[PDB]
Amino acid sequence: MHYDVIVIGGGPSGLMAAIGAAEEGANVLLLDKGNKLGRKLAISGGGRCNVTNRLPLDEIVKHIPGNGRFLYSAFSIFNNEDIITFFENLGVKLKEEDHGRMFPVSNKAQSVVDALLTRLKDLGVKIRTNTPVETIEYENGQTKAVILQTGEVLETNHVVIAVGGKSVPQTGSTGDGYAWAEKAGHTITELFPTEVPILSNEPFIRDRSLQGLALRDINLSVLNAIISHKMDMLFTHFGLSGPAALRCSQFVVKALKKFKTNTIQMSIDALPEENSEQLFQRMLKQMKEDPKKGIKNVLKGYVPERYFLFLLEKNEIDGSEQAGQVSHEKIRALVKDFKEFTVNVNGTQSIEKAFVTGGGVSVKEINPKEMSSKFTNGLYFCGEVLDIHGYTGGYNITSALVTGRIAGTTAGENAK
Ligand SMILES: Cc1cc2nc3c(=O)[nH]c(=O)nc-3n(C[C@H](O)[C@H](O)[C@H](O)COP(=O)(O)OP(=O)(O)OC[C@H]3O[C@@H](n4cnc5c(N)ncnc54)[C@H](O)[C@@H]3O)c2cc1C
Ligand SMILES: [Cl-]
């Protein structure tokens, strides 16, 4: 046993785990499949890396819908503000942008990766690139060895699994970690994509009626209800995309899986600022100002023209009908479609194409203060391989950095 701790995976969690263990005085090996460490980290935040989020604790947890509450213990030890200080000290100043989102002053993800690599070098962590792991050996409820794809055996009593999820496999995250966890006794929460476009075969989608149409600042709901507020949506050839749709997508997936229906209902509130009474009266007070003018001109500007004209048809209103020859029941209907237009949807894009993989190693089986397995001694987990996931805004890297630091410092401590 040359190595006190072996960390498998050099994403943000693995890099923090290796630093965490080496600070505890352990001789640490960090293994990665790729020719470079931090490939996904290097593309994160549009190439700038949204490293963390400075919002208060309770808001951070709320933005991590996949087991955010599990992180309460971790955050007591090492939290968002601690992340900011940590990076400052490694010479990579951060800045705050919108909605609490923190980015390097350099505006370059590579800056973050390089700082972490420099700290590993300073601490004497051994790094082996192009070194894929095949499996982990366990005996007597304890970790015994890491087995490389080549067959090379690396004996150790402390292994940190930091290999990420299943999305964007070109970066190295191909779901290798789940089988190792199962071998160790763990359950895997069923995997689902997050932040992906939603599919629909509604006739109006198939006939491209609204294709390319952006609806700005809408409320998009998944009915049963889960609601994304004041975000933009886009109608595509295949369904719904844009921030509002992407946010709802994990909820579409779960629902379809739980229930075994072919479609589920979504609802679009195109004008969330205004209630159906205010909107109805707005519309009357305009139909009276110009009762001889065509309704398609009297009521322009409420929603984009293509959506407007589609909804008129749907409600059997001739756009050229005189504003004072349109029945008030048919206007009430138009207002209901402005506030709650239903769209049946029937799936989403795949996990390969997702932002983050939802599901993973169950956190019920992990000691929250340690990131240690409850089943196998000398086994630790961190990052996206765990069943933790965040919305966009820095939350996923927050969790990876935090869990990686706790897992690493616990391993390094245990190994001594
Ligand atoms: C396009 C994109 C942009 C993103 N932007 C942000 C953002 O701005 N902010 C944010 O908070 N989140 C962002 N995310 C998500 C965030 O990048 C991830 O959640 C995070 O990188 C997960 O960190 P990790 O350490 O768990 O795993 P990863 O970063 O996925 O790293 C895992 C490492 O494990 C290695 N590995 C895998 N299998 C093996 C094996 N068998 N043997 C050896 N090594 C192996 C891989 O080569 C890889 O280097 C983004 C995601 C995507 C895809
Ligand atoms: Cl993000």
Ligand that comes closest to the CA of residue 80? 1
Query: How would you list the strands of the sheet with 126-128, edge to edge?
Result: 126-128, 28-31, 5-8, 159-161, 379-381, 372-373, 366-367
* Atom 41 (ligand 1) nearest CA: 133
Pairing relationship of beta strands 126-128 and 28-31 according to DSSP bridges:
parallel
103 bridge partner residues: 95
Reduce the DSSP state of residue 138 to 3 states and report it: strand
The dihedral over CA atoms of 17, 22, 26, 29, expressed in degrees to the nearest 10, equals 60
* Other beta carbons less than 10 A from residue 293's beta carbon: 16
Q: Which domains does the chain have, with CATH numbers?
A: 1-194+351-416 (3.50.50.60), 195-350 (no CATH)
* Atom 6 (ligand 1) nearest CA: 44
Angle at 242 between CA 240 and CA 247, to 5 degrees: 90
Reduce the DSSP state of residue 211 to 3 states and report it: coil
Distance (angstroms) between ligand 1 centre and the Cα of 260 equals: 31
- What whole-number distance in Å separates Cα of residue 135 and Cα of residue 354? 26
Distance (angstroms) between ligand 2 centre and the Cα of 229 equals: 18
Angstrom CA distances, 139 to 3, 29, 284, 373, stand at: 18, 21, 77, 15
264 bridge partner residues: 345
Angstrom CA distances, 68 to 74, 175, 281, 351, 357, stand at: 11, 21, 43, 21, 15
Helices and strands: H and E segment counts in the chain = 14, 22
- Sign for the CA dihedral angle at 206, 210, 213, 215 comes to negative
Pairing relationship of beta strands 372-373 and 153-155 according to DSSP bridges:
unpaired
Residue 38: closest CA among 131, 109, 135: 109
| DSSP class per residue in 148-183 | ETT--EEE-S-EEE----SSSGGGT-SSHHHHHHHH
Resolution as reported, in Å: 1.8
Residues of each annotated binding site for FAD: 13, 32, 39, 45, 50, 133, 176, 384, 396-397
Cβ–ligand 1 contact at 13 (below 6 Å): yes
Reduce the DSSP state of residue 264 to 3 states and report it: strand
Roughly what angle, to the nearest 10 degrees, separates helices 80-89 and 395-415? 80
Structure tokens at 287: 């139909």
